[PDB]
Amino acid sequence: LSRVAGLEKQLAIELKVKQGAENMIQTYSNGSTKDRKLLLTAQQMLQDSKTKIDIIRMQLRRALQA
Amino acid sequence: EYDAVWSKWERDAPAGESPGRAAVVQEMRDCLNNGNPVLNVGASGLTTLPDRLPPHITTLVIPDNNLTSLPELPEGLRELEVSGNLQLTSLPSLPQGLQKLWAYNNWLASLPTLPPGLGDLAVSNNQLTSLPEMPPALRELRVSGNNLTSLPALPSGLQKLWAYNNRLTSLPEMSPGLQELDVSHNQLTRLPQSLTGLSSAARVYLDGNPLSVRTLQALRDIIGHSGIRIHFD
């Protein structure tokens, strides 16, 4: 199928992004008042990537019907 | 009492949070006086909810907010949806008669023991590293987007399972009545024998896992003998 490969690539990318975000969150969890904003940003990014994975995966499950 | 508690809660609004709380209060008074079964607080930027919700509401919807915690829930609550609260790491004890629990895109570290009647559980994009025992009546389970390294025993009535995007090393045994299983981007190098007992109409996505040559050829043989659709990656 045409779109499958592309969807999987998007998956690899967003997964990499998710990994990165997780590592950021882990690094800034020291709890310093200075890293607060960086930590929150890292969180929002993690959540974003996960949601995108959910959506792209819905689309992918659709693409696997043929 | 109720209206007094809600009024107090409104006057106690933090700076900038007044209009939102007033709206929520309108909603709650609607539920109370007009018997509206559903309470939707919307996204008000709420940092807190009143000590007590309307008693007779069946369904509760909490969108993106600042909530650190939830108040004790009404005994007759059938459905609960909590989403978009990054500082909410914990749910309150859940009413036994609860059917649908959708709590996702939050910070939850753990879940409280789940009510037996629960048939639909979606907790995704949370911090969960573990799950409690599963209610026997649960037909739909979405745990994806978590830290889970494993799943507990699955109920005989489960029609759907999404474990994808986790740390899972191993899947548990599965009931033949499972329609859809998506486990992706996990650590599984192996799969449970019960997988063979599934219906040929089952949709199983294994992509994103190490698996193994033995497991891969096992899957190919199983496909040859069955005709069920499976994913390899």
Swiss-Prot record, chain A:
Residues 57-61 are annotated as: Important for interaction with bacterial SspH1 and SspH1-mediated polyubiquitination. Found ubiquitously. Expressed in heart, brain, placenta, lung, skeletal muscle, kidney and pancreas. Expressed in numerous tumor cell lines, especially in breast tumor cells. Residues 1-66 form the REM-1 domain. Changing residue 57 to K: Decreases interaction with bacterial SspH1. The C1 domain does not bind the diacylglycerol (DAG). PKC-related serine/threonine-protein kinase involved in various processes such as regulation of the intermediate filaments of the actin cytoskeleton, cell migration, tumor cell invasion and transcription regulation. Part of a signaling cascade that begins with the activation of the adrenergic receptor ADRA1B and leads to the activation of MAPK14. Regulates the cytoskeletal network by phosphorylating proteins such as VIM and neurofilament proteins NEFH, NEFL and NEFM, leading to inhibit their polymerization. This is Serine/threonine-protein kinase N1. The lineage of its organism: Eukaryota, Metazoa, Chordata, Craniata, Vertebrata. The gene is PKN1. The chain holds residues 125 to 190 of 942 of the full protein.
Swiss-Prot record, chain B:
It comes from the Bacteria. LRR repeats lie at residues 56-77, 78-96, 97-118, 119-136, 137-158, 159-176, 177-199, 200-220. Induction: Transcription is maximal in the late logarithmic phase of growth. Expression levels are similar in the intracellular and extracellular environments. Ubiquitinated in the presence of host E1 ubiquitin-activating enzyme, E2 ubiquitin-conjugating enzyme and ubiquitin. Changing residue 164 to A: Abolishes interaction with host PKN1 and PKN1-mediated release from the autoinhibited state. Coiled coil: none annotated. Transmembrane segments: none annotated. It is found in: Secreted; Host cytoplasm; Host nucleus. Effector proteins function to alter host cell physiology and promote bacterial survival in host tissues. This protein is an E3 ubiquitin-protein ligase that interferes with the host's ubiquitination pathway and targets host proteins for proteasomal degradation. Can ubiquitinate ubiquitin, giving rise to polyubiquitin chains (in vitro). Polyubiquitinates host PKN1, leading to its proteasomal degradation. Down-modulates production of host pro-inflammatory cytokines by inhibiting NF-kappa-B-dependent gene expression; this depends only partially on its E3 ubiquitin-protein ligase activity. Interacts (via leucine-rich repeat region) with host PKN1 (via the second REM repeat). The LRR (leucine-rich repeat) domain mediates interaction with host PKN1 and inhibition of NF-kappa-B-dependent gene expression. Belongs to the LRR-containing bacterial E3 ligase family. This is E3 ubiquitin-protein ligase SspH1.
